[PDB]
Design a protein around this ligand. Structure first.
Ligand SMILES: O=C(O)CCC(=O)C(=O)O
Ligand SMILES: [Mn+2]
Lengths: 19, 429
């Protein structure tokens, strides 16, 4: 996905890295 | 309930139960060894192998170890390779495998597991819905859309599938088409539909078509805990940060940054104008479906707290100036960028994703008439060489009806009530 730079257009806005 | 024991596993149920009891008591190390002995002695046992995987999963939580969890993810797959696995156990094991792969950010791996689940269980609608989420997480809206169309062709009133289909349509700017899917999906109350993303986009779609019911959905989203208020609809929040649409420099405490921007505004302007004249491909059009009409582009120097080295070659003096201010260069939930907007531009009402930043605007080239910005219920104009500050997690809207271009510099800062410890740990956005 792209990034949520200015809004909430992507399904998720953060990238998961486990613990 | 589930039926987890095959014929042979029923014959060793007492041993299997003893190992699981150690795990349920939190004696994780002893349970690991208990299930290891059962896997050693009974290498084909699906329940022993699942026990091994669940203990590895618990051990990963205790140690906060990604690598231990990778082991669990492999053992969950080993369960599925074994002979004569009961259907309930096969589904539990591969569902947890995909879930843990997503936790690690292994989104392509989760997708493969989800595809396998749908092939193994062709009549389980929820597994197809989960596969669609897998596609959404890797950014494949086209394949996600096909999955939810397959779901809806068999179960047209599945509420999970409706809200996700609606979300996809909305992202594709199919605004009117998205509204009944988002609305009926939320109204289903099905598991997975009571989600801030769907209230956010249902209300936004309604606003864009002029449907006055939009704020009823914002009120409901607020009542259900998704939004701090009907005006402030960010979804990635630290609760309790001071919430107001407009801020003074003194209220932010970032007075040294504001003084630097206002004393040195002309060098920032001049570098922006030189890029407009000689390097205009550094300005990239807005790409988040936020315009009704017109032309609006940004030249980004920092994003997610990372300097763009090639971009800073286009504004070297401005980048040198800003390096003195980690409250903005280290704001991993914000950007630093030039922003140009031309006449005939209307930016739809929208909100940013997070209450963890405040957004400063420095005026660089401001036509005397035609340009204004609303945040919540208050509208303001820019001035050349002067900073405005607002919280873009509040709904805001912009118009450009001048007779020449309007250039600003946008500088995001951490919300001032965030402690250094919070600023170091929050995930970037
Ligand atoms: O006016 C601009 O260029 C930016 C407006 C906006 O939506 C913002 O600053 O978040
Ligand atoms: Mn904005």
């Amino acid at each position: 996905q792209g990034k949520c730079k200015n809004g909430l257009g992507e399904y998720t806005c953060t990238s998961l890295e486990g613990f | 309930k589930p039926k987890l024991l095959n014929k042979f596993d029923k014959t060793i149920k007492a041993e299997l139960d003893a190992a699981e009891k150690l795990r349920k008591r939190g004696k994780i190390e002893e349970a690991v060894n208990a299930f290891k002995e059962l896997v050693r002695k009974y290498p084909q046992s699906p329940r022993a192998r699942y026990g091994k995987a669940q203990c590895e999963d618990d051990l990963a939580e205790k140690r906060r170890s990604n690598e231990v969890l990778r082991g669990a993810i492999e053992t969950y797959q080993e369960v599925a390779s074994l002979p004569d696995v009961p259907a309930d156990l096969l589904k539990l094991s591969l569902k947890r495998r995909s879930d843990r792969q997503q936790f690690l950010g292994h989104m392509r791996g989760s997708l493969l597991t989800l595809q396998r689940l749908v092939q193994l269980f062709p009549n389980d609608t929820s597994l197809k819905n989960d596969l669609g989420v897998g596609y959404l997480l890797i950014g494949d809206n086209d394949n996600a859309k096909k999955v939810y169309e397959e779901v809806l062709s068999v179960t047209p009133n599945d509420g999970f599938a409706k809200v996700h289909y609606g979300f996809i349509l909305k992202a594709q700017n199919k605004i009117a088409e998205s509204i009944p899917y988002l609305k009926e999906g939320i109204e289903s109350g099905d598991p997975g539909t009571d989600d801030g993303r769907f209230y956010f986009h249902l209300g936004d779609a309604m606003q864009r078509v002029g449907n006055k019911e939009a704020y009823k959905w914002y009120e409901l989203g607020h009542k259900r805990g998704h939004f701090a208020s009907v005006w402030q609809r960010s979804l990635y929040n630290v609760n309790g940060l001071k919430a107001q649409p407009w801020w003074t420099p003194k209220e932010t405490g970032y007075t040294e940054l504001v003084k630097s921007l206002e004393r040195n505004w002309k060098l920032i302007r001049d570098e922006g104008l030189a890029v407009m004249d000689k390097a205009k491909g550094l300005f990239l059009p807005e790409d988040e479906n936020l315009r009704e009409k017109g032309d609006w582009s940004q030249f980004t120097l920092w994003q997610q707290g990372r300097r763009n080295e090639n971009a800073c070659k286009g504004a070297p003096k401005t980048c040198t100036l800003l390096e003195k201010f980690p409250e903005t260069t280290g704001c991993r939930r914000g950007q630093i960028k030039y922003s140009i907007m031309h006449p005939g531009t209307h930016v739809w009402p929208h909100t940013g994703p997070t209450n963890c930043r405040l957004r400063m605007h420095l005026g660089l080239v401001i036509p005397k008439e035609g340009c204004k910005i609303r945040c919540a219920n208050e509208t303001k104009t820019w001035e050349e060489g002067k900073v405005l500050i607002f919280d873009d997690s509040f709904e805001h809207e912009v118009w450009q009806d001048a007779s020449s271009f309007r250039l600003i510099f946008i500088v995001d800062v951490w919300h001032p009530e965030l402690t250094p410890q919070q600023r170091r740990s929050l995930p970037a956005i």
